[PDB]
Design an enzyme around this catalytic site. Structure first.
Site, PDB file in Angstrom:
ATOM      1  N   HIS A 117       8.819   2.470  10.635  1.00 38.39           N
ATOM      2  CA  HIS A 117       7.603   3.166  10.196  1.00 38.39           C
ATOM      3  C   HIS A 117       7.213   4.221  11.191  1.00 38.39           C
ATOM      4  O   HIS A 117       7.715   4.264  12.307  1.00 38.39           O
ATOM      5  CB  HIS A 117       6.408   2.233  10.060  1.00 38.39           C
ATOM      6  N   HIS A 118       6.319   5.100  10.718  1.00 40.12           N
ATOM      7  CA  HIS A 118       5.712   6.177  11.514  1.00 40.12           C
ATOM      8  C   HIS A 118       5.187   5.720  12.844  1.00 40.12           C
ATOM      9  O   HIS A 118       4.799   4.577  12.966  1.00 40.12           O
ATOM     10  CB  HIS A 118       4.544   6.836  10.733  1.00 40.12           C
TER      11      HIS A 118
ATOM     12  N   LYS B 204       1.827   3.468  13.447  1.00 41.94           N
ATOM     13  CA  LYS B 204       1.576   2.174  12.847  1.00 41.94           C
ATOM     14  C   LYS B 204       1.217   1.135  13.928  1.00 41.94           C
ATOM     15  O   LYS B 204       1.878   1.026  14.969  1.00 41.94           O
ATOM     16  CB  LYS B 204       2.745   1.711  11.999  1.00 41.94           C
TER      17      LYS B 204
HETATM   18  N1  NAP Z   1      -0.370  -3.340   1.468  1.00 43.59           N
HETATM   19  C1  NAP Z   1       0.184  -2.112   1.388  1.00 43.59           C
HETATM   20  O1  NAP Z   1       0.867  -1.758   0.319  1.00 43.59           O
HETATM   21  C2  NAP Z   1      -0.021  -1.114   2.477  1.00 43.59           C
HETATM   22  C3  NAP Z   1       0.435   0.187   2.392  1.00 43.59           C
HETATM   23  C4  NAP Z   1       0.158   1.055   3.438  1.00 43.59           C
HETATM   24  C5  NAP Z   1      -0.545   0.574   4.558  1.00 43.59           C
HETATM   25  N2  NAP Z   1      -0.935  -0.725   4.602  1.00 43.59           N
HETATM   26  C6  NAP Z   1      -1.765  -1.276   5.660  1.00 43.59           C
HETATM   27  O2  NAP Z   1      -3.106  -0.740   5.432  1.00 43.59           O
HETATM   28  C7  NAP Z   1      -3.778  -0.573   6.694  1.00 43.59           C
HETATM   29  C8  NAP Z   1      -4.287   0.840   6.912  1.00 43.59           C
HETATM   30  O3  NAP Z   1      -3.227   1.754   6.999  1.00 43.59           O
HETATM   31  P1  NAP Z   1      -3.515   3.301   7.312  1.00 43.59           P
HETATM   32  O4  NAP Z   1      -2.232   3.901   7.750  1.00 43.59           O
HETATM   33  O5  NAP Z   1      -4.290   3.915   6.202  1.00 43.59           O
HETATM   34  O6  NAP Z   1      -4.396   3.193   8.636  1.00 43.59           O
HETATM   35  P2  NAP Z   1      -5.395   4.292   9.253  1.00 43.59           P
HETATM   36  O7  NAP Z   1      -5.055   5.682   8.807  1.00 43.59           O
HETATM   37  O8  NAP Z   1      -5.449   3.931  10.699  1.00 43.59           O
HETATM   38  O9  NAP Z   1      -6.759   3.927   8.511  1.00 43.59           O
HETATM   39  C9  NAP Z   1      -7.627   2.933   9.031  1.00 43.59           C
HETATM   40  C10 NAP Z   1      -9.005   3.080   8.369  1.00 43.59           C
HETATM   41  O10 NAP Z   1      -9.771   1.907   8.618  1.00 43.59           O
HETATM   42  C11 NAP Z   1     -11.015   2.303   9.198  1.00 43.59           C
HETATM   43  N3  NAP Z   1     -11.596   1.261  10.060  1.00 43.59           N
HETATM   44  C12 NAP Z   1     -10.968   0.581  11.038  1.00 43.59           C
HETATM   45  N4  NAP Z   1     -11.839  -0.286  11.620  1.00 43.59           N
HETATM   46  C13 NAP Z   1     -13.011  -0.112  10.979  1.00 43.59           C
HETATM   47  C14 NAP Z   1     -14.261  -0.692  11.182  1.00 43.59           C
HETATM   48  N5  NAP Z   1     -14.398  -1.652  12.130  1.00 43.59           N
HETATM   49  N6  NAP Z   1     -15.270  -0.339  10.399  1.00 43.59           N
HETATM   50  C15 NAP Z   1     -15.101   0.641   9.467  1.00 43.59           C
HETATM   51  N7  NAP Z   1     -13.907   1.255   9.256  1.00 43.59           N
HETATM   52  C16 NAP Z   1     -12.854   0.854   9.999  1.00 43.59           C
HETATM   53  C17 NAP Z   1     -10.655   3.532  10.005  1.00 43.59           C
HETATM   54  O11 NAP Z   1     -11.746   4.296  10.452  1.00 43.59           O
HETATM   55  P3  NAP Z   1     -11.785   5.160  11.842  1.00 43.59           P
HETATM   56  O12 NAP Z   1     -11.023   6.422  11.577  1.00 43.59           O
HETATM   57  O13 NAP Z   1     -13.302   5.260  11.921  1.00 43.59           O
HETATM   58  O14 NAP Z   1     -11.157   4.298  12.926  1.00 43.59           O
HETATM   59  C18 NAP Z   1      -9.820   4.229   8.968  1.00 43.59           C
HETATM   60  O15 NAP Z   1     -10.615   4.867   7.960  1.00 43.59           O
HETATM   61  C19 NAP Z   1      -2.786  -0.991   7.763  1.00 43.59           C
HETATM   62  O16 NAP Z   1      -3.114  -2.347   8.090  1.00 43.59           O
HETATM   63  C20 NAP Z   1      -1.416  -0.893   7.082  1.00 43.59           C
HETATM   64  O17 NAP Z   1      -0.473  -1.816   7.618  1.00 43.59           O
HETATM   65  C21 NAP Z   1      -0.717  -1.526   3.584  1.00 43.59           C
HETATM   66 CL    CL Z   2       1.762   1.549   7.330  1.00 49.01          CL
END
Ligand code: NAP
Ligand code: CL
Ligand code: NAP
Ligand code: CL
Ligand code: CL
Ligand code: CL
Ligand code: NA
Ligand code: NA
Ligand code: NA
Ligand code: NA
Lengths: 266, 267, 267, 266
Positions: free
Chosen positions: A155-156, A159
């Site tokens: 992954h990128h 992550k």
């Molecule tokens: N299940 C699936 O199919 C799938 C697919 C893709 C990704 N994922 C998972 O989904 C998650 C997110 O991925 P991503 O790449 O989108 O991550 P990301 O770009 O880092 O997004 C994280 C988001 O969560 C917010 N956040 C974190 N802590 C918070 C808090 N305490 N209160 C309010 N907002 C909070 C962040 O806000 P800030 O910018 O304010 O920190 C941001 O908006 C990861 O765990 C990844 O492994 C799952």
């Molecule tokens: Cl991811």
């Protein structure tokens, strides 16, 4: 039209969910949550995806984000998602949890919350991975432990969690096929080991780099042959659309903790 | 036809060298040397590889092993290899050195002997592995560090070293290309960590399973593109093939201390 | 910050260039040029990419487009590109030329204009694709033709060209390394043939399916080992990224006619 | 101990079969056939594999090779194998046919011969490929033809037939999963085509080079994701041992035309 709230809205998946809700007639964007103190607070949700005005004002207040909605779409961060599952329990909202990297206590709490509402929790929302997990289980049952199971993913660079939730999900399918328990046989990072490989163990290797959306490969390595089963995600829209499919399925379903298998078939 | 002596013959690459020479017309086995007092002394070389009688009697005397040969193929021990390099200087023999573990003094002596004969010295003698290393170093120099370098390898279940020696060689090629020190930037098993990747690091992921001879892949992962450079080993005979290429290239080449990069034409 | 003009802006790479420049601080969009009488003339550049107002009014007049800029980014048409290269010579502007299809005369004129300014001209502007081509040529020269060269690519279901242009570029790199002519040694689709492989040929296998942006892999398959060199495209924006690298590299470089190999440091 | 004759004995697979029979107690080498005029005729079979004296004299005469045996192990060439299947019919011998590249008439004749004796015919004798074919059928049934099926393989420079028999076997499993007929939807060598891909077709691409024993990959390429199922053969011994397993299974079985699926399970 189902009314949905997107949390972690400024994140990669958050923006992708907003883009997907906007292109569809069957789901409606009704709220957008970001962290307290975000510069996006009070702006229109359109700013997150470069679209035309949506008439949805971004908030940092969960009470507001969750006041007039039918579901929560949540790809965010594990502590945040347990918090939102509690709100989902308190307010009887469906909660689609894509977030990964939960501890055992966090998972125990999410199970508590599933007593009061409908929660679909899955480490991968794509059709391809859920089919792959099935194929890996069948493979792990047809091939005895003379075939060594070794799981790789890339992954990128940014992550946070490793192995990926997809890797863990695939490892759990392999463990089931072998009638063993993953926690007893998993080995993370053989790179930092010396020794003969232990028979029956399932190994995990992980690369992190660039912008890769997600590659996963399960190798079954036997005597003079390998079977390799793989999945390549091209873009995040596949997970955004799997989440929307899960929301629609959860809408009038009974309380409980469910997976994309339940949503899909399967 | 080039006449060759295989030394360290009951050791690591000895059988592979003898097997590879037996199946070719352009190289001729003329001597086989083993450690002092070996059971194999006075036996025919065929006993090492289970062939028909080869007409070459195994010796533990370097005087006999080097008496009428054109090159020395050597994957033995540092102190033996310095001695044999002296024989190669005295007798004008080429010397292919796959031995590892040399001290600084031993390396200085080998540099002396290269004034009088042609020596090709490389810790890994596969044509493909050395090519790959060179291409990796070139890529690491050409691409800025907004391309992340990740190194993957897979080997059979019983492999001891981890990461493999070849992985480390490839890692050192990347570090050189980036003008950094492998030891400061290397990260083993990102699997066993949490957090964002640190910029400029080189990751190593290793897989162990089954009977795999050795796969190595270097990914350069940048903004919306990746370059992936790989070596896939089918048989262990590749190291003997390279050693023989090096011998044939060394034969009428001018004196000096060379590597497989020189044999490949890459300077 | 470097001021750039995007030409051919309603054509192939125009939107990608404008999008890429808008998201960076080190390059500034100062002009956008389109074909004479385009609907887009007098509109703000934002209309091409659906952004907010950019403060850059689209023109079809080269006099205006080049009046106060530092470089020209050009993926348009041969005859337009010769004209723009003349503007670049007259006004001391760098010129990044991704246009293809030039006549011999047009190429001679561009060579003239390179006496007065810095021009980077390449049919493919991806940093990774040009690197890969160079590594392929190096490998093809280093490995004898007992290493067979096979080229594979995969693209989305609707792709028209087959083999892809990038496959052909990579094939020509291999042919150059081997000192042979692609047209005499190429074999398309061994799937539709019977018999042993002919020595020294370069095979092309092409897969079409789904939405794949573009995978390319070159295998050098020798005696019991293979080297595999690959490029994996994630997004089409990679061509704009390279064009911008080339612009930034060209800015204070000396006059001449350069390629992406020069931008990458590979001569 | 089953008494077996190896035909095409000097070939790559022929030598590999002799090596495998020699290391086992349950099968016995009783004859070795090579082409008329071969320099190996009258020599001991040991010369083919560098072993100790076996006391089996190599012949170019099928009557001799087939006179005192229980089965024929045959990885050779399609015209030769139809000829040997006739001998197998005439003399009531089992015939294990690994050869590939048969025409439709040749296949029709082999079916005739299966009326009089037991014939196991398969384009891949390995356990891994026979499991892979199963997984490909399930995959092709779970994924509709929005997922484009594309089969790739690589083999050594001197391989005569393309696509490989394994590729064809995998294509037939995919066609079954899709409830279509392979011959109606197969496209060999898209490299020599212009056009949009036709929906529902199964494409075949093949590389030939060096010494590669055999790689096969089936890609299911959908909207923004791929599933890839693969097999890597490390050495020919896996096919030699699959053939011996087939011989032992065929020994007291009734007449007919069978596959490695029948031998294995499966
Ligand atoms: N299940 C699936 O199919 C799938 C697919 C893709 C990704 N994922 C998972 O989904 C998650 C997110 O991925 P991503 O790449 O989108 O991550 P990301 O770009 O880092 O997004 C994280 C988001 O969560 C917010 N956040 C974190 N802590 C918070 C808090 N305490 N209160 C309010 N907002 C909070 C962040 O806000 P800030 O910018 O304010 O920190 C941001 O908006 C990861 O765990 C990844 O492994 C799952
Ligand atoms: Cl991811
Ligand atoms: N089903 C599987 O699992 C599997 C695995 C591996 C290979 N294969 C298939 O098995 C076949 C053989 O492969 P290979 O690599 O071993 O080929 P090979 O090395 O070319 O061996 C061919 C053998 O057949 C003999 N032969 C050909 N025509 C003959 C004739 N008219 N009369 C007598 N002998 C004849 C050849 O003899 P000469 O030397 O006299 O020509 C040689 O001994 C191929 O069709 C391949 O696709 C199948
Ligand atoms: Cl020794
Ligand atoms: Cl235009
Ligand atoms: Cl074959
Ligand atoms: Na909507
Ligand atoms: Na010889
Ligand atoms: Na800008
Ligand atoms: Na036996």
């Amino acid at each position: 039209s189902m009314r949905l709230t997107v949390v972690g809205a400024n994140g990669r998946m958050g923006r992708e969910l907003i883009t997907a809700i906007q292109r569809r007639k069957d789901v409606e964007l009704c709220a957008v949550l970001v962290r307290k103190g975000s510069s996006f607070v009070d702006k229109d949700a359109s700013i997150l995806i470069g679209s035309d005005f949506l008439g949805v004002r971004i908030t940092d207040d969960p009470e507001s984000a969750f006041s007039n909605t039918e579901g929560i779409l949540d790809f965010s961060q594990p502590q945040a998602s347990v918090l939102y599952a509690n709100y989902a329990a308190q307010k009887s909202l469906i909660h689609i949890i894509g977030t990964t990297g939960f501890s055992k206590t966090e998972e125990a709490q999410i199970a508590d919350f599933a007593k009061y509402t409908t929660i679909v929790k899955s480490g991968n929302m794509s059709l391809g991975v859920n089919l792959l997990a099935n194929l890996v289980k069948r493979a792990a049952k047809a091939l005895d432990d003379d075939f060594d199971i070794e799981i790789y993913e890339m992954h990128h660079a940014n992550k946070v969690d490793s192995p990926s939730g997809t890797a863990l999900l695939l490892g759990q399918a392999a463990a089931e096929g072998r009638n063993i328990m993953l926690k007893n046989v998993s080995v993370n990072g053989r790179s930092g080991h010396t020794g003969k490989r232990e028979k029956g163990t399932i190994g995990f290797a992980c690369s992190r780099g660039g912008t890769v959306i997600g590659d996963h490969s399960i190798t079954f390595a036997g005597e003079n042959e390998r079977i390799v089963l793989s999945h390549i995600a091209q873009e995040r829209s596949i997970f955004a659309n799997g989440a929307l499919k899960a929301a629609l399925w959860a809408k009038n379903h009974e309380n409980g903790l469910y997976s994309m298998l339940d949503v899909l078939g399967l």
